[PDB]
Amino acid sequence: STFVAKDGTQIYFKDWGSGKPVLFSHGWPLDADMWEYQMEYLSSRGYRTIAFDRRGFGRSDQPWTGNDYDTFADDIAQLIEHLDLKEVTLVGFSMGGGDVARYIARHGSARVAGLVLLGAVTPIFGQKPDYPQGVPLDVFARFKTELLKDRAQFISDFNAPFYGINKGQVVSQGVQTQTLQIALLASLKATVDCVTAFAETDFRPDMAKIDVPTLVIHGDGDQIVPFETTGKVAAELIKGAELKVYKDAPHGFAVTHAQQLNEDLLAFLKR
Amino acid sequence: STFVAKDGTQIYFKDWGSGKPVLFSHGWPLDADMWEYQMEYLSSRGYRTIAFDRRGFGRSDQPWTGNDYDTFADDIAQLIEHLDLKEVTLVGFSMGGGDVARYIARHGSARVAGLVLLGAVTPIFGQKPDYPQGVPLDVFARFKTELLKDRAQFISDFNAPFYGINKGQVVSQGVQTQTLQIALLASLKATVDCVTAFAETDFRPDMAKIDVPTLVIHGDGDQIVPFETTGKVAAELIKGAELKVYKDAPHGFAVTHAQQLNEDLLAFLKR
Amino acid sequence: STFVAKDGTQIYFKDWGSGKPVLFSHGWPLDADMWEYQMEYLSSRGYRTIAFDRRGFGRSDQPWTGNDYDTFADDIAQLIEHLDLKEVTLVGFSMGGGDVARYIARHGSARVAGLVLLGAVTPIFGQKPDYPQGVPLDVFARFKTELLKDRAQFISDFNAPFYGINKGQVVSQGVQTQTLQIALLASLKATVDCVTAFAETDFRPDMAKIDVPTLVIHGDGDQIVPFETTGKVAAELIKGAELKVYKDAPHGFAVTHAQQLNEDLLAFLKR
């Protein structure tokens, strides 16, 4: 399916099943296919699942402009409104945690029943003057420099730390192949702009606007988005939030811990 | 090109050349590209060739519902009507033998000039009470469990028995790469539902409704769809049907035996 | 974005940034993604960059007909008119040098500010009676024969001589993977028809009609499109043209010499 954003950007999405809606927001630099197992799992169990390809990624158009969290949040708003979704459970992975949080911050939670933040960059990822514990911005500056030389090999190399393959985690060649195939669909511009967006966007104000039941899940072996300064803090800043730590789990735990995640999502939905 | 099915599903297809039409229905889990060489071969020799991506596959939309043979058959009917095809020669490979047969069964053969079944699941694939010779259903249950864990590696591993590489057939890494790239475009849901469909759908009633010239081709080295209980039987059950057996040929013989197939299709069309 | 050509062919394109427009025409058998680094480079420096997927390639439709230079040039004219571009700088790589040249020849230069030809097939690639120094047509005949057997492995094998990896150039597996992934998107029919087109089309008449500032860049290590009978000659045939030779550069120098190319394009635009 597709809808056209306000600025003309065609956005690809899938809308599967029927029942209470669950809307998924993917991480960088992937697309809606990263959710395929959670979607099949939940839609076979009485839920409607929706996942979109973020602008610049997967099967969506690749705009030069609007590659920022306010626009991402507003894209999500358009999708929710054009489908007239109610009592939606928002589920964001990695950078996708930011745009579902920013959606609520900008649009409020009238249409929202719950929020799930998976290995999310929330509430803040890169260093700020009052957040020296964040990742130094020159780390991301170097990522961008490498991406602007050879994004294909960069993402290929990223497979290891992403899935924790370098820490013995076990992920097939097929999954690594699929990851790269998907990432190569994306815009170079969007791929690089997103790094700027997730490195420097502060979602701490957003955390105070979240007034729905929230589940934060994070692996404490996460090499990409450090649990201690993200998920752990998000769970404390969101009132009533529940925290689940997957022991030793990597960033890419929707793959490595698929069954556990499926069951935790179902449990949250049935709470 | 695209058309919109009854339920709103957008289906991609290619329509090449001019003259008598030949419509191709691909196997699992591929798309219209698996036919590219047959299409160029025939269309450069004065035929019109048409091939679609089955719903849930390749460049087509990925609906949650309708992943069954009655819907596949009606998708074909809609394409045929959409182009107003007449004297069409229907060519199906593997599971694709099922929807061309079911199309005839449901819509009759007024628009049909001939039928070709290549390594097809017809007339029946999985076991039934009166068909213990069929493939046991727990075989397919197990395929589905593996697909629901890691479809990417499952399909990568499938390359060997599919192409008979483990039995002396020679197939390039490029072809294996292209096969996987195509497979990964598909919906997880369609990929799994199709297994249920070809595992359990009985086309024996369909055979009795086929009243056009018919050619069945099958490899007797086929490790995927056993010649003895499918192609061999389909050729007996369809009145007037011709049978060609490619000795020691694998399931993926449109690759390994491309030139032989091209020539056999041309010979059939010029009968 | 897309537009629809005269014959119904839907053509994918990207349109990034704002300012004076630079329109990119890709080589065989790639798509607009081959330009992604040049586009980001120039659009972040005040230019508007546009690149299309040639008919039959990338995300464009795959027509059986019209795979020739006159149609390609007319496709470009349609895009320029669609966007109503003025003072456009045309940049063609490899076979893409041909359709921007043929555009000017068929439609004039009223809308054109400048022309860049990179490793281009211009002014003539294959042998003619008065051009025995061109590549013998039997060389292309054998290529087409191999393409019609196994295009996937053909393109895979082509990576080495294309990027000069066999002569000491260094290009990542990631880039080689992306090259093949893009190539596989293309039509088999378009892939083969383009060989016919670039092998036999004479652009020498076109060179005489080029009345805008022109820059020709070519690597003298080019194993694919021989510098001495293409780029070297186009620079002399085009009045006022400038020639830059990248020492020992391969055909795929937009990859191996990316920064150099980026700086040369910027310098040309600011000339």
Description of the molecule:
Three copies of one chain form a homotrimer. Chain A is of the alpha/beta class and 271 residues long. Chain A has one domain: Rossmann fold (3-Layer(aba) Sandwich), CATH 3.40.50. An eight-stranded mixed sheet of chain A has the order 1-2-4-3-5-6-7-8, sandwiched between helices. In chain A, helix 4 crosses helix 6. The first copy, chain A, is globular and about 45 Å long. The interface between A and B is medium-sized, with 19 and 19 residues. The PDB classes it as hydrolase. Keywords: alpha/beta hydrolase, covalent adduct, Hydrolase, Oxidoreductase, Peroxidase.
Considering DSSP H and I runs of 4 or more, what fraction of the residues of chain A is helical? 40-55%
Task: Examine the coordinates and then state which fold CATH places here, giving the name of the CATH topology of chain A.
Answer: Rossmann fold
Give helix and strand order of chain A, one letter per element, not per position.
EEEHEHEHEHHHHEHEHH
Coarse morphology of chain A: globular
Order of strands, main sheet of chain A, comes to 1-2-4-3-5-6-7-8
Pfam family, one (chains A, B, C): Abhydrolase_1
Catalytic activity (chains A, B, C): a phenyl acetate + H2O = a phenol + acetate + H(+); peracetic acid + H2O = acetate + H2O2 + H(+); a percarboxylic acid + H2O = a carboxylate + H2O2 + H(+)
GO molecular function (chains A, B, C): arylesterase activity; peroxidase activity
Subunit structure (chains A, B, C): Dimer of trimers.
